[PDB]
Design a binder for these strands. Structure first.
Ligand SMILES: CC(C)Oc1c(NC(=O)c2ccc(NC(=O)[C@H](Cc3c[nH]nn3)NC(=O)c3ccc(NC(=O)c4ccc(C#N)cc4)cn3)cn2)ccc(C(=O)Nc2ccc(C(=O)O)cc2)c1O
Ligand SMILES: [Mg+2]
Ligand SMILES: [Mg+2]
Lengths: 517, 402, 517, 402
DNA sequence: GATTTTATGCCTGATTCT
DNA sequence: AATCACCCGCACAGATTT
DNA sequence: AGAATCAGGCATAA
DNA sequence: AAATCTGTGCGGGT
């Protein structure tokens, strides 16, 4: 037993909880716009080899793997997170391809884990591109047994296109979806000029674009949101009044509803309103949506005008909603309020870093392969002494030592060995003792071991020439990689080409319409 | 109501436990001493009485069950702390952030609704362990990460570890242990300030000598130090880094503006060093440690490890090898929660009257506690945001350098 | 809206259900005594490589794999089946080594799938011995995508050893356990003489042997059950009366209980019986069973007699139970009532078939390997002409055709072939055109391809001698395999040796004691 | 409680469904015409009223809920079929053995407790699909295995597949389709006689010439026939078994039989092609197919699949190649149960009035049905066992094979 | 992570009819 | 086989008191 | 007084 | 008749 003040305990405990929640659950990372749970689920699915053109897997398998290996929390949260990513009416671009009963726009329900199946989507492989080439940092899991990426090497601007929504202790975040083609055009515009103003950026990005294709009634909140990071917009449904003459009948047909609105609750609320005499002029209400489109039919009395009741419905029920844009994201492990230009700059810097690291890795691999091929080509030109030495030796170790002991004359292949750019095709870790010396070649241990593993099939002409062709190709590849690493302008051209390819592959049309008041 | 009452009726030797979850509650019920101990599992997070109205408090099932179990009344003109039951109360929540949040909620409830119970000292907080270590015969439990680090450091230097430098010296215990502890303290000091500078620069400055500000001059003296540091940094790289430098003068002192670049076409453009940095005590203690930490190893050197001899340089690798040797026959387990522990472990770790450890809650000041509770658990967001931001990492960036 | 008679629908549906339950759910197979669920679980565990000397695995993983791949049924049944096999007090020889909480004799229940762990036992690997040598037939799973064994190549008499219990439509089966050493001795006695009567077999097999080590009362029921296949036996608990003089009051101590009896229910029934004055002379009841062993204490009244009160407990309480032996099993896909001799004969026939198939597979593999080794030795004998011809080869196909269309000299290796003559090692499918005809070897297509895949490392002396050693030992192996198939007595000798080895490895002592009335 | 009622009040346009499993019922509740359709999920197997007593039947909850939902009474002097709600009733159970068992239980309940309901024709049985096939654009549902086989056969011969004998003939559809159908029928006939004779013996007889028992008599040509058969069998043997022949002249027509030693290490005494086998119609149709299946293929031949070509030398090889090539861009899904289907699929397969398919239950005879119900569902084990044994594999040996 | 009551056959003990 | 009953921040009707 | 009837337990499936 | 008060839902966690 030892006394302790209540104030210190309360302060320390609550500060620990708040700091854990702020940077552990709620806010997303600016570079890729994914919470830790999304990243862990995607990595777990990637490791199992659950690609987009293979058979499905049960949700229980993925959930159990994630819980056991990476994510030490309950299963209901993980399963709900998985279910949310597979709904066409929640994300602009779905990241999981599901099969089963994943729910509908009415907010009905979702089947349990043992009655559904999932796999990765085609676009989801773009986020995890070049993951194996040492392009991102890995960190330990909760028990120092596994490794998880610190951030995905994303190629899609996920944060803007898919949006986000989260609640933390003392702050929150809410960002709506956008259109991919517009964002890519904005990024290309920014790359050409870093001093672009917000007005210039808004020419390529008029505004949000929800999955449900509602109507945005206003244009003043979008500018404020993109200029300061906080704003407010209004989303209105799509409806019209059609008259069939005869007895002057009027009927209201509703096609498209706002974002994040349940149809069943809307219908029940309208029924309750007309029942309690709070809205006059409505006769009957019906739903007729089946597999082809959304249609809600409202009949009005013969002694009323459709426009007044329609405006009353807009003002009273949930057909018109308000959406408060509030952008908060993690920059370097701290929350921060951002605007469009900061997000674009962060994405561009992330891409530059990823491309540079990938280039370095590829250069290293190419140099190692060329180093091995040089030894094989040099060995192939001295067949008779090599076979005599191997036959005379009693043991492979003695043959290896005998091969390493003496230098070997280059022969007729000296034309191409000296044609390289001095030390361009030479590994950095190799000592100056070995390599192409003055008129003779010196072998290492690994080169001798590689020579001992050569097959008799390589003595043919075609196999002999293929090695020389591969070496010649590798020289050009190394030269190209060095040129890419040299200047700072080739990197921008590569980034532009990648962005253009992504835009061509995954582009689509706009849905939401924007009009003035 | 999930309450397993005890047998003793005298309200001066009873106890009550408020366990988190259902599996932990079942294990505690299995492993309790049935004579004078009771259990009361909680399913999840409970009502926040600071924000909730008085009428809604009595409607909630969890707080109503808790009030009924305690036996006292609620509200003015009915609360009667004299007719109390379970004079000793223990919280015993999980050892993660959710456990701390539930602990704060329970403390808020007890302080707001029953101040006299907290004042008289009838609320206790348990402290279950986190790590378990086994070495064949010697096995034990370890609480918190600092104790684990201390245990690992002690086991690393548990006998032997005679560092033979040149011919036959011997630190023989205390010298080596003190040097290692001071090095670990300096490493922690570097880590807390790791954000503002690269690791390589701080790790290399310890090996360099003092700045020698006495003979500093605009030419032929300022450049030599920075050039030597850059040359020492450049020839030890594995990520394609590059260190460059420049210096300038402002009629007072000769200031350095070193620059570094790695895996980026951008450039920070400045890592300035001036009179402020050398005047700081961090550099003083770094130089103090580096005076002992020099190239003392000769061509022949080794450590007289038990049935092992590893003659090498770069003493960091020697420390890593020693840690590997220590972990050769060591097993470690990390409990995920109270559910993992079996009933016997729970009985002997926290519920045993003669081997448990607990904390007693007491109040130092009343107005300060009331203001803190109102600021944190109140329904005003701006003061809470200001309080959280004030005590963020900026407050943790303490420049005491000691 | 086609019509259908009720009688036809009822008949077809009920007959289909009855046949499926009879031949797929309840009765075991006579050859290995495993129901389909047990076989599928063991096969699924074997495929994952969950051996008996490796790390444990979660129960949920194995259960999910079994459900998804082979067994199209629920999770609770499979998990209960796995749990029952890991209990030391349910099976005589456990088939699954478990870690966690798998219940207790008192009446507790095991934990969920999320917390327990399992792996294969040492004895289980004997049931699946020589599974990969084409010893048993495979059949498709429900969706025609996987293969499952039709019956395991068991090496243990599992049916008699572990017993069985099952309820089918129109019939049921119930067989008690036995001891391994006695059953193996009976099998060897049957092998020595095939006309042994039931009386001769009962010399080696006195009777059942339960795991709980109770007492068996009577001897007529066992003999009747073995002779005909239906019988009844009495299982009585072990108890004693002890007195320490002094006060002159005795107490009844119970150490053991019958098979399939709960301790808690027995104690509560005794308490209820003594409560209602239905049993006289009992004062106190206590249970001191913990860790060290089982002990139930009954302290009698001062005027009571130990024998009189003790005899009433057997008559009233559940300390004595009746077990009904009824042997039913599948012989050739139909139910039948068996006795001891039929079971032993079926096991012996199964072993003979398995050994024959294994021998055929081994012989084929040995001949195929020797065929390639001959070509490699011949090629190495004449290495210099081979490489000289290969060097002038435009492509590998031309080299292969040149090698095929040319005889080669045997050289100094021909002497070895004098030991390999008599056409003993030639493959059956090989034509007489190839091989040695007049002291000049003729190569085939596959031999030439194997020659082209020769590494330089094998040009050393040690590698050259290793091939000759391999060929020399393969000749002896082929000779032994031929001699095994050339006679019938050698098969029985091999079977006897295998049975003796199994008895030595997995022998144990007897538990239950048999006494007359 | 567990009953989603409909809006229609007139008891002549409503319907009721008895879905198996809670997940299937929940899925079906979403995908239904809410105006005049109701749902009533069943958790699992229900009470058997044939063996149970009246009091226990009333005590249960599932049958009690069903009786309440139907609206009629129970027992004599209270039962009144006129007061019937939900004039149309559909079962819609799973498509496995347990589904059939539950269907039989429900039929027993309805027939024994409400005979008039079954007599008037107010009971229906649904037929949900089993397979789903997609080929990029076309998508369809297929029931059971027979329709899947027919779909596979039709897809195999869907365009192209112009078989070439020597240079370039063209069977072009109907002839090839007839040949394939005849081959499949003969293989199906062969598959149902594996117990009596080996598969290889039947397989080899089709290619060899007809025995021609009419002109055989005692010319001793049967010896060469059986010798050639044994040599052909042993030529491509790959299982280690051996074959021999035996002949004799017990009558005017010489008789012969093969002897086979197989992997089991036991030798069968004979598999005689006796008078019945040669006079049987099975061998006659085998020879009829073999007459068209002689060595029609010349030295050069191939199968002309669409924009593809491959040389072949056997009819089975051509069939296998065509089947494998037809399964390139075909995707197949198999439903394990009703819980694997989303509401739209259930609606468009079983609940849509304009595209669903059902069976109406009617009674042909009363005494026979009563006897069958008493025999099968009664509590007499021996009559049920005898009935099952009578219709066992002993009665399955149908000699028609057509 | 904890949440119902049925089918199918053979044996027992306890209670209920004649 | 999905549901229990709360914590965190933000915006907006319908309902009480000044 | 002795047949006849009614519960509960056991192991794989909804 | 202007100003407080009182609920509901969005998405990751016991
Ligand atoms: C079975 C499945 C779930 O998962 C697996 C598992 N499982 C695990 O590996 C596992 C999962 C969780 C734990 N957890 C813990 O040990 C800790 C202990 C503890 C104690 N105290 N704190 N923590 N518990 C928790 O973290 C925790 C979290 C949340 C909790 N409560 C709530 O949220 C909650 C509370 C209150 C209310 C209210 N009002 C509501 C909610 C409580 N506890 C350990 N192991 C394993 C394998 C599989 C698998 O591979 N299956 C599979 C493969 C292939 C196939 C095929 O062929 O199709 C099919 C299937 C699987 O699916
Ligand atoms: Mg926890
Ligand atoms: Mg099923």
């Amino acid at each position: 037993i030892t006394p302790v003040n209540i104030e210190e305990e309360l302060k320390s405990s609550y500060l620990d909880y708040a700091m854990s929640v702020i940077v552990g659950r709620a806010l997303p990372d600016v570079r890729d716009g994914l919470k830790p749970v999304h990243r862990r689920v995607l990595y777990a699915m990637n490791v199992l080899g659950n690609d987009w053109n293979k058979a499905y897997k049960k949700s229980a398998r993925v959930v159990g793997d994630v819980i056991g290996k990476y994510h030490p929390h309950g299963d209901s949260a993980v399963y709900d997170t998985i279910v949310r990513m597979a709904q066409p009416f929640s994300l602009r671009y779905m990241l999981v391809d599901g099969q089963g009963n994943f729910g509908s726009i009415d907010g009905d329900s979702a089947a349990a884990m043992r009655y559904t199946e999932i796999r990765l989507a085609k676009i989801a492989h773009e986020l995890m591109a070049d993951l194996e080439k040492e392009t991102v940092d890995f960190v330990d899991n909760y028990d120092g047994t596994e490794k998880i990426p610190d951030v995905m090497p994303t190629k899609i601007p996920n944060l803007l296109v898919n949006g986000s929504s989260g609640i933390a202790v003392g702050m929150a975040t809410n960002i709506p979806p956008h259109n991919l083609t517009e964002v890519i055009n904005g990024c290309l515009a920014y790359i050409d000029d870093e001093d672009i103003s917000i007005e210039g950026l808004m020419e390529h990005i008029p505004g949000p674009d929800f999955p449900t294709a509602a109507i945005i009634n206003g244009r003043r909140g979008i500018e404020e949101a993109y200029r300061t990071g906080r704003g407010k917009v209004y989303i209105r449904a799509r409806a019209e009044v059609e008259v069939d003459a005869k007895t002057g009948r009027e009927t209201i047909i509703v096609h498209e509803i706002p974002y994040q609105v349940n149809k069943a609750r809307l219908i029940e609320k309208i029924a309750e309103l007309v029942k309690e005499k709070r809205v006059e002029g409505i006769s009957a209400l019906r739903d007729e949506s089946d597999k082809d489109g959304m249609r809600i039919v409202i009949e009005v009395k013969r002694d009323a005008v459709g426009e007044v009741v329609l405006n009353n419905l807009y003002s009273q029920t949930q057909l018109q909603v308000s959406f408060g844009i509030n952008m908060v994201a993690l920059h370097h492990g701290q929350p921060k309020i951002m605007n469009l230009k900061d997000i674009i700059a962060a994405f561009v810097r992330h891409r530059r870093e990823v491309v540079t690291r990938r280039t370095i890795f590829e250069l290293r691999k190419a140099r190692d392969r060329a180093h091995i091929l040089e030894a094989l080509a040099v060995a192939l030109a001295n067949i008779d002494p090599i076979i005599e030495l191997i036959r005379h030796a009693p043991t492979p170790a003695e043959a290896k030592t005998a091969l390493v002991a003496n230098p070997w004359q280059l022969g007729n292949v000296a034309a191409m060995l000296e044609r390289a750019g001095d030390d361009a095709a030479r590994p950095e870790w190799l000592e100056p003792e070995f390599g192409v010396r003055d008129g003779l070649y010196y072998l290492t241990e690994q080169q001798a071991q590689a020579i001992l593993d050569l097959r008799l099939q390589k003595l043919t002409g075609l196999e002999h020439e293929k090695l020389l062709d591969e070496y010649k190709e590798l020289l050009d590849q190394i030269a190209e990689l060095l040129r890419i690493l040299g200047s700072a302008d080739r990197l921008m051209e590569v980034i532009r080409e990648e962005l253009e390819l992504v835009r061509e592959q995954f582009g689509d049309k706009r849905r939401t319409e924007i009009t003035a008041n | 109501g999930k309450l397993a009452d005890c047998q003793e009726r005298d309200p001066a030797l009873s106890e009550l436990y408020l366990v988190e979850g259902d599996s932990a509650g079942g294990s505690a019920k299995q492993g309790r001493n049935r004579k004078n101990q009771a259990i009361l599992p909680l399913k999840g997070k409970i009502l926040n009485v600071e924000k909730a109205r008085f009428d809604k408090m009595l409607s909630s099932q969890e707080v109503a069950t808790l009030i009924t179990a305690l036996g006292c009344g609620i509200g003015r003109d009915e609360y009667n702390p004299d007719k109390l039951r379970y004079h000793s109360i223990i919280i015993m929540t999980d050892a993660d952030v959710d456990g701390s949040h539930i602990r704060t909620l329970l403390l808020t409830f007890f302080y707001r609704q029953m101040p006299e119970i907290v004042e008289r000292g009838h609320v206790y907080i348990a402290q279950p362990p986190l790590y378990k270590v086994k070495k064949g015969k010697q096995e034990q439990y370890i609480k918190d990460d600092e104790a684990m680090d201390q245990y690992q450091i002690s086991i690393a230097l548990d006998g032997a570890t005679l560092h033979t430098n040149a011919s036959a010296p011997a630190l023989a215990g205390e010298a080596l242990e003190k040097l290692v502890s001071e090095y670990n303290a300096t490493q922690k000091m570097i880590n807390r300030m790791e954000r503002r500078y690269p690791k390589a620069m701080l790790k290399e400055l310890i090996y360099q000598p003092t700045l020698t500000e006495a003979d500093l001059s605009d030419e032929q003296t300022v450049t030599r130090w920075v050039n030597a540091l850059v040359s020492e940094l450049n020839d030890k790289e594995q990520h394609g880094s590059q260190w460059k430098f420049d210096v300038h003068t402002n009629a007072e002192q000769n200031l350095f503006e070193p620059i570094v670049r790695v895996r980026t076409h951008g450039v920070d453009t400045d890592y300035p060093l001036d009179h402020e940095f050398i005047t700081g005590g961090e550099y003083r203690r770094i130089c103090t440690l580096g005076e002992k930490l020099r190239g003392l190893l000769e061509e022949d050197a080794f450590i007289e490890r038990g049935e092992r001899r590893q003659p090498v340089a770069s003493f960091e690798q020697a420390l890593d090898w020693l840690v590997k040797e220590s972990r050769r026959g060591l097993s470690i387990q990390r409990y995920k929660g109270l559910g993992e522990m079996n009933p016997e472990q729970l009985w002997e770790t926290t519920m045993d009257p003669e081997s448990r450890r607990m904390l007693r809650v007491t109040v130092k000041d009343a107005i300060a506690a009331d203001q803190l509770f109102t600021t944190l658990m109140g329904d005003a967001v701006e003061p809470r945001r200001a309080f959280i931001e004030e005590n963020a990492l900026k407050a943790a960036n303490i420049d005491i350098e000691n």
